[PDB]
Specification:
With 188 residues, the protein is of the alpha/beta class. The protein has a single domain (2-183), classed as Rossmann fold, CATH 3.40.50. Helices cover 23% and strands 29% of the residues. β10 and β11 form a beta hairpin. The chain starts with a strand and ends in a 6-residue tail after the last helix. It is classed as transferase.
Length: 188
């Protein structure tokens, strides 16, 4: 099962529905749910930090990102919070607007397996990762965003700037399935 921290964004239920659609159970929990409380249930195979408006009211995500012994996928805000947690930088970039963005996949990684090196993702660029944390690498970029995706090189932690959980993201379910694979799910 995948635990979804609700950071307040409006696509949180889409994450549940997208996971379920590929046959993965998930549970939406307040973003103030302690790490120890999430990890107390061995059914929890991984954590998704959802999108949301305010990085200050998602502070608890920083502890989870740093100290969880489970795989983590941060989505938009979640991606930014992982960056902060590991000493990266984030800031305002473009202007708030959801647009189909052409995303280029820069290297072979588990997150983008069976995803074309070029695909259209549903994204806002209100904010972005400005400096990638020490020990992380860039997985993907667009013409307006240098860090559309990243991973921790030595921990199973992933960030995506865009929303794979909306139907408008090409291969968005494949990207969720790939995360679930790292969490020990198989899709044969």
């Amino acid at each position: 099962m995948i635990v979804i921290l609700d950071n307040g964004g409006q696509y949180v239920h889409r994450i549940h529905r997208s996971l379920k659609y590929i046959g993965v159970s998930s549970k939406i929990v307040p973003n103030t749910t302690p790490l120890e409380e999430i990890e107390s249930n061995k059914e929890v195979k991984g954590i998704i930090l959802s999108g949301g408006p305010d990085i200050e009211k998602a502070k608890n995500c920083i502890d989870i990102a740093l100290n969880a012994k489970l795989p983590i996928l941060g989505i938009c805000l979640g991606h930014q919070l992982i960056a902060l947690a590991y000493g990266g930088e984030v800031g305002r970039a473009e202007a708030e607007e959801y647009a189909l963005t052409k995303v280029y996949v820069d290297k072979e990684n588990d997150l983008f397996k069976n995803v074309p090196r070029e695909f259209n993702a549903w994204a806002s660029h209100k904010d972005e990762v400005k400096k990638v944390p020490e020990g992380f690498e860039i997985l993907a970029h667009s013409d307006i965003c240098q860090v559309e995706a990243m991973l921790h090189k030595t921990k199973p932690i992933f960030g995506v700037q865009f929303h794979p959980e909306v139907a408008h993201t090409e291969y968005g379910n494949e990207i969720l399935k790939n995360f679930c694979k790292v969490c020990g799910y198989k899709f044969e």
